[PDB]
Design an enzyme around this catalytic site. Sequence first.
Site, PDB file in Angstrom:
ATOM      1  N   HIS A  60       0.850  -1.225   0.000  1.00 62.26           N
ATOM      2  CA  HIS A  60       0.000   0.000   0.000  1.00 62.26           C
ATOM      3  C   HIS A  60       0.870   1.254   0.000  1.00 62.26           C
ATOM      4  O   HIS A  60       0.471   2.247  -0.572  1.00 62.26           O
ATOM      5  CB  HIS A  60      -0.949   0.043   1.213  1.00 62.26           C
ATOM      6  CG  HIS A  60      -1.752  -1.192   1.409  1.00 62.26           C
ATOM      7  ND1 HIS A  60      -2.806  -1.533   0.576  1.00 62.26           N
ATOM      8  CD2 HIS A  60      -1.693  -2.141   2.361  1.00 62.26           C
ATOM      9  CE1 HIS A  60      -3.359  -2.655   0.999  1.00 62.26           C
ATOM     10  NE2 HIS A  60      -2.683  -3.053   2.093  1.00 62.26           N
ATOM     11  N   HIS A  90       5.611   7.001   6.644  1.00 67.44           N
ATOM     12  CA  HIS A  90       5.279   6.608   5.263  1.00 67.44           C
ATOM     13  C   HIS A  90       4.709   7.825   4.557  1.00 67.44           C
ATOM     14  O   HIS A  90       4.460   8.876   5.189  1.00 67.44           O
ATOM     15  CB  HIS A  90       4.280   5.443   5.241  1.00 67.44           C
ATOM     16  CG  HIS A  90       2.978   5.810   5.900  1.00 67.44           C
ATOM     17  ND1 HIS A  90       2.750   5.624   7.210  1.00 67.44           N
ATOM     18  CD2 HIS A  90       1.879   6.427   5.379  1.00 67.44           C
ATOM     19  CE1 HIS A  90       1.531   6.096   7.509  1.00 67.44           C
ATOM     20  NE2 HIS A  90       0.983   6.585   6.398  1.00 67.44           N
ATOM     21  N   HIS A 115       3.413  11.047   6.660  1.00 65.69           N
ATOM     22  CA  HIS A 115       2.800  10.713   7.955  1.00 65.69           C
ATOM     23  C   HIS A 115       3.850  10.131   8.883  1.00 65.69           C
ATOM     24  O   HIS A 115       4.322   9.029   8.611  1.00 65.69           O
ATOM     25  CB  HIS A 115       1.656   9.713   7.761  1.00 65.69           C
ATOM     26  CG  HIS A 115       0.476  10.317   7.076  1.00 65.69           C
ATOM     27  ND1 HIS A 115      -0.553   9.551   6.492  1.00 65.69           N
ATOM     28  CD2 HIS A 115       0.150  11.642   6.892  1.00 65.69           C
ATOM     29  CE1 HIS A 115      -1.439  10.428   5.982  1.00 65.69           C
ATOM     30  NE2 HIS A 115      -1.027  11.688   6.212  1.00 65.69           N
TER      31      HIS A 115
HETATM   32  O1  LIG Z   1      -1.760   5.648   5.964  1.00 64.25           O
HETATM   33  B1  LIG Z   1      -2.422   5.885   7.238  1.00 64.25           B
HETATM   34  O2  LIG Z   1      -3.890   5.659   7.089  1.00 64.25           O
HETATM   35  O3  LIG Z   1      -2.136   7.245   7.684  1.00 64.25           O
HETATM   36  C1  LIG Z   1      -1.789   7.379   9.045  1.00 64.25           C
HETATM   37  C2  LIG Z   1      -1.536   6.019   9.561  1.00 64.25           C
HETATM   38  C3  LIG Z   1      -1.811   5.090   8.566  1.00 64.25           C
HETATM   39  C4  LIG Z   1      -1.660   3.727   8.893  1.00 64.25           C
HETATM   40  C5  LIG Z   1      -1.164   3.342  10.154  1.00 64.25           C
HETATM   41  N1  LIG Z   1      -0.947   1.963  10.461  1.00 64.25           N
HETATM   42  C6  LIG Z   1      -1.690   0.895  10.154  1.00 64.25           C
HETATM   43  C7  LIG Z   1      -1.023  -0.179  10.660  1.00 64.25           C
HETATM   44  C8  LIG Z   1      -1.360  -1.616  10.632  1.00 64.25           C
HETATM   45  O4  LIG Z   1      -1.307  -2.125  11.958  1.00 64.25           O
HETATM   46  C9  LIG Z   1      -2.490  -2.229  12.653  1.00 64.25           C
HETATM   47  C10 LIG Z   1      -2.542  -3.023  13.785  1.00 64.25           C
HETATM   48  C11 LIG Z   1      -3.729  -3.134  14.487  1.00 64.25           C
HETATM   49  C12 LIG Z   1      -4.824  -2.451  14.035  1.00 64.25           C
HETATM   50  F1  LIG Z   1      -5.988  -2.557  14.724  1.00 64.25           F
HETATM   51  C13 LIG Z   1      -4.794  -1.658  12.922  1.00 64.25           C
HETATM   52  C14 LIG Z   1      -3.611  -1.544  12.218  1.00 64.25           C
HETATM   53  N2  LIG Z   1       0.118   0.273  11.257  1.00 64.25           N
HETATM   54  N3  LIG Z   1       0.172   1.584  11.136  1.00 64.25           N
HETATM   55  C15 LIG Z   1      -0.858   4.295  11.081  1.00 64.25           C
HETATM   56  C16 LIG Z   1      -1.042   5.627  10.788  1.00 64.25           C
HETATM   57 ZN   LIG Z   2      -0.769   7.542   6.092  1.00 60.61          ZN
END
Ligand SMILES: [O][B]1([O])O[C]C2=C1[C]=C(N1[C]=C([C]OC3=[C][C]=C(F)[C]=[C]3)N=N1)[C]=[C]2
Ligand SMILES: [Zn+2]
EC number: 4.2.1.1
Length: 256
Positions: A60, A90, A115
């Site tokens: 992604h 990212h 971000h």
């Molecule tokens: O591109 B963005 O939407 O912008 C801001 C942002 C994005 C994605 C993350 N992000 C997602 C994950 C996956 O890990 C997870 C673990 C447990 C969960 F419940 C959910 C996700 N790690 N960091 C953090 C911040």
């Molecule tokens: Zn993001």
Amino acid sequence: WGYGKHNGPEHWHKDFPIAKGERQSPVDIDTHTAKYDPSLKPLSVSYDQATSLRILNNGHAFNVEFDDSQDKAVLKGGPLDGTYRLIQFHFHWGSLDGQGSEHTVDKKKYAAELHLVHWNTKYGDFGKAVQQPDGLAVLGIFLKVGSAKPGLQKVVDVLDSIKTKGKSADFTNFDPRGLLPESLDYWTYPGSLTTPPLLECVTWIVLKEPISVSSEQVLKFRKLNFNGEGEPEELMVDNWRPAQPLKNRQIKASFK
Ligand SMILES: [O][B]1([O])O[C]C2=C1[C]=C(N1[C]=C([C]OC3=[C][C]=C(F)[C]=[C]3)N=N1)[C]=[C]2
Ligand SMILES: [Zn+2]
């Protein structure tokens, strides 16, 4: 889920109904409607002891990951209560210089958006923090195309080694201070992850001042692939969610 016509933002609500929730991100920042809050504190960005580890193509975007097992790189102050540890950064970017940012400013789209993701240390780990309304603090920085950003070039230069989904490379000794603009003036509002699972756990802190990157730097982002090695090539471009309704929220400004 992804960013194609068949699995993109218009489809996410079917698996993640919170997509139509009360505090979704990103939003349009109406600069004339944002409220100057003289009680907002200066941001405290403390990155001098940051320990970068690895860069990963996750299908992604690409993530630069940090050691978040101690208070090495932390965000405090501004609208935040307590200490938020940097876990990764990212970007989101476009197929064209006139799109790519998630947040917009008076409906203006930037070429990309950085971000820097931090989690609230009172919740112990990132997985617990994302289940809390104040679990994450994301520092958002706009990228415009102009002069090169020297502090970005180490990222640009390694992308050849993580072209496809699931590839990673060593990315030690990277200083994320080289990605910041001069000013820490910001807007803030309560919102969400901009990707599934779209959890409403983020305090957004979006810097007013964009950084400049060169056309060649963002061109290299666009040579990445969404696909795995040995799959048909799908260029990693337009990995942004459009602006969502503000609903019952106020955007606050740290500056007049
Ligand atoms: O591109 B963005 O939407 O912008 C801001 C942002 C994005 C994605 C993350 N992000 C997602 C994950 C996956 O890990 C997870 C673990 C447990 C969960 F419940 C959910 C996700 N790690 N960091 C953090 C911040
Ligand atoms: Zn993001």
